[PDB]
Symmetry: D3
Subunit: 173 residues, 6 copies
Amino acid sequence: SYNNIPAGKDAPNDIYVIIEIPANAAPIKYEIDKDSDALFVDRFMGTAMFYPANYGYVPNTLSEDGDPLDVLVVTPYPVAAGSVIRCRPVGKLNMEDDGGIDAKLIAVPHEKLSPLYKDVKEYTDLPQLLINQVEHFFSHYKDLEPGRWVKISGWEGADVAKAEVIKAIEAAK
Amino acid sequence: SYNNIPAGKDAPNDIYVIIEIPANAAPIKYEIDKDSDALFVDRFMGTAMFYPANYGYVPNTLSEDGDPLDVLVVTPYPVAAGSVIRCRPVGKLNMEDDGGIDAKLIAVPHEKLSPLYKDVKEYTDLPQLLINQVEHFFSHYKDLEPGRWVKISGWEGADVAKAEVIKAIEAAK
Amino acid sequence: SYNNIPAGKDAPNDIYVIIEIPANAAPIKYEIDKDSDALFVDRFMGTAMFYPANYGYVPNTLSEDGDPLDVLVVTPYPVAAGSVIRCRPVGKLNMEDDGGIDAKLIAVPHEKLSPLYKDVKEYTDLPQLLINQVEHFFSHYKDLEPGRWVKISGWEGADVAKAEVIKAIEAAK
Amino acid sequence: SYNNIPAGKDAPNDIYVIIEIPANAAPIKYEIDKDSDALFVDRFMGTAMFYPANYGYVPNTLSEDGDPLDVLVVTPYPVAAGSVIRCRPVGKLNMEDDGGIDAKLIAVPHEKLSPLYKDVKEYTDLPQLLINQVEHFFSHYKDLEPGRWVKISGWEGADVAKAEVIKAIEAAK
Amino acid sequence: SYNNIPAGKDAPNDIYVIIEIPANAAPIKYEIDKDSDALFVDRFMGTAMFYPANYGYVPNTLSEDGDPLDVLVVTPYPVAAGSVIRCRPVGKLNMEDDGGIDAKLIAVPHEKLSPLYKDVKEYTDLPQLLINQVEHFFSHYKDLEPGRWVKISGWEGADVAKAEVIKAIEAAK
Amino acid sequence: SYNNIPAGKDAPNDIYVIIEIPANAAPIKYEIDKDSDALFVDRFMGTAMFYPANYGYVPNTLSEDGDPLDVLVVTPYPVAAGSVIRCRPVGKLNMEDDGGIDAKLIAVPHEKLSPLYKDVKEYTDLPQLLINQVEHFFSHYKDLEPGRWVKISGWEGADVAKAEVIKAIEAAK
Ligand SMILES: [Mg+2]
Ligand SMILES: [Mg+2]
Ligand SMILES: [Mg+2]
Ligand SMILES: [Mg+2]
Ligand SMILES: [Mg+2]
Ligand SMILES: [Mg+2]
Ligand SMILES: [Mg+2]
Ligand SMILES: [Mg+2]
Ligand SMILES: [Mg+2]
Ligand SMILES: [Mg+2]
Ligand SMILES: [Mg+2]
Ligand SMILES: [Mg+2]
Ligand SMILES: [Mg+2]
Ligand SMILES: [Mg+2]
Ligand SMILES: [Mg+2]
Ligand SMILES: [Mg+2]
Ligand SMILES: [Mg+2]
Ligand SMILES: [Mg+2]
């Protein structure tokens, strides 16, 4: 099962993220069910938008909302829902949503998977438009769903993002 | 495993369906294997047709033929093979095929997943062309495979479909 | 060439729209060039959004910005960029953008192309969520491009939309 | 324009086919308009089926019904709508439909485009399942559209198909 | 889990292959993890190439590199990553890579899945171009990853391939 | 027609490229026919490879092989075959093939189309793996076609690439 996957081979610089929603996918919000490891349709999203990067979570972590830590992973090609990417965090997007505090990390593939991100040490080393697209997506993707909303606080860098991994690993143990 | 998913949160009005074949997919007839939870290729379909709705089954149900209850689920976008949709039955298509009695329910997503089906209470509230496409698909998709065949009896409404769910949940106990 | 296509077989109830951008497509903003009939990439759009309906124009019309009249066409499947669809207007979305007044019509296919829209006489007969998605898309698709913006005024019905077609046809003569 | 393309480099053994509908495409029945060269949506097809081969016509041919000769082209990958394939006829499917006589040729790519068809000299050298799929598609794809219908007479071989090309090239002069 | 799937219903003539990479897919090299059954991204491949057949392994086998036996499966349509296909071996491609001896079998679906391969008894009954594409892919897909390389020895037939299946099954006990 | 499109609004820093083959497309080598403006299938390519960037030509130019100048354009999303991209050259790949000298440019979208490439002044500002993928593709894509082959000479920078545009513009006038 997914719970047999550690949070990382060497956290926080070498972690695993289980993908729930591929980048550039149809507007279906999938979530993995802890009790079955199965991909559930949480909802069909209301706006004409798509997640700008692959979206999932670090196994064996615990965030403030009670679920594993949320991570977006930038990849050269969208990966299959349910697949697992070895990656490295480069930034943290601080937000609050209708349910409470909701920070999410952004990460890039580990060097063993690709050389493309070797020089991406901070989220500011990704394309500025991509960073803006990520923030704009979370700012607006709940606009057509009543009772759902997002407040953006802002971005923090790779040191804070790596800290967040450690926090969530320690919270689960 | 899939067997940890209940038949529904509040059956028969609120059920779960595990999808084997997405709507509008390539002509590969996948089936989930009970003893591995794995998606098997049952066959490559012989006709140039596609399933007009997502196709799957209700976990923890048992029909009189020893398999879970079959369900077609209408969705605004096709859902991934192996994913699970919370939905609501609105009708039943009575058929017999080369394997015996073969009724299949038709369902729409629960209102928590989409607002688009709030007025669909009976299968006759779906577009008539879609109902005709479902009937036509099952009447013909086996035409080019030796020894496979379908007889269509007709449709029944939401109350009959809900009673079928109750009966199949009972049988699994 | 495209200019041999009339504005309609029986405008304004029966018109042709040349599609530039398919519904649900990648964020490439194509525009057909008057001087060559060729599809140009006007831009790669800045936001993680998609046109919620097929987007194009009525040939042999002239709208307020000097170009043919803009029309969104709802279809059961997205139609290819550069293809031509026989359709019928059911509404008008009034907007202003960074270039000036920018109304766009919304239309559904002629009954010879699909039976699915026979009961759609006004834009309010389309799904409310789709109407909201169209408004939300135009409100936000320029959010990440400096100097580009949109202000929505509101909708008008089929009779107003049909009068806009007549106005743009006569303005071209 | 398309009318500048000859019927072939060396007809009837070496012909050109302009594709209207790719193999395995969405159920949109496109047709090229003679007076604009533009791809029109003739209709959205009513059944859950797809064309099993690429479908188009030979330019600068004229059958006795006033339209160019129809050709299905088998290719290793589906080709884009509006593109032109150099190919070689290997058979003829005789049909009558709601519009009158409706024979369609079947062809394979010229050896300069692919080595995969060197041993396909007759339509019976193609996979039997594919031949059956073509027949089944035309027998059923109009089933859900009022007033549309097909009668299938049977197949003829490559020599008959080649004579049909010669006859249709003659008629266009 | 996957390990409940036997190596075959009647090995070596009738085997199961769990697919990791679909034919003609994006250049994502998935591998199933033994400890979790989950699909991991091993890497994003460096070259602009795709696997010419579906790629996976036989469960409950052990090959020379300590992992289950590798098999390519030719299918009429690419099958999803993680799905399981009943097939039959027809050849063996002998290679050495940067990790050591690396033979891979090639197989076609069982006749219950498709009639299209009934006459394919040896790998030489597949299209020569496909065999060449498989050799060329393995010869070059690692060309842009330093430290990864492949040397091709050549092919052996179905009887040798079937003996390799028996060898890997017994080696797992 | 395409010939109404100038080589650029302000060559060599602001040019138009007509795309024949989208990035990451199926292995179909399309070429636009000068006499009809139609997209022809030149061949189905022999190797399991794909063009790593969109491929096409500058209208109203003349290269040493007698045809308009060949250009690859890097884009965030593959563009439709036959569409036209406003772009700017950043490098030149010198090659000779079975027909003679065969240099090709690489370009990025003009700033009016996207901000993503503002800092890409030279081909060495693109990802090194992408540059290697382009060279590797041309080195190998003819490996399975007899009589077709490529010799790589090497890359030159943006100043030489801009020169090549001017050379080919002047050659056509
Ligand atoms: Mg969360
Ligand atoms: Mg979550
Ligand atoms: Mg949230
Ligand atoms: Mg089943
Ligand atoms: Mg069943
Ligand atoms: Mg059945
Ligand atoms: Mg406009
Ligand atoms: Mg416009
Ligand atoms: Mg505007
Ligand atoms: Mg036609
Ligand atoms: Mg015809
Ligand atoms: Mg007909
Ligand atoms: Mg191996
Ligand atoms: Mg392996
Ligand atoms: Mg290897
Ligand atoms: Mg050239
Ligand atoms: Mg060329
Ligand atoms: Mg060349």
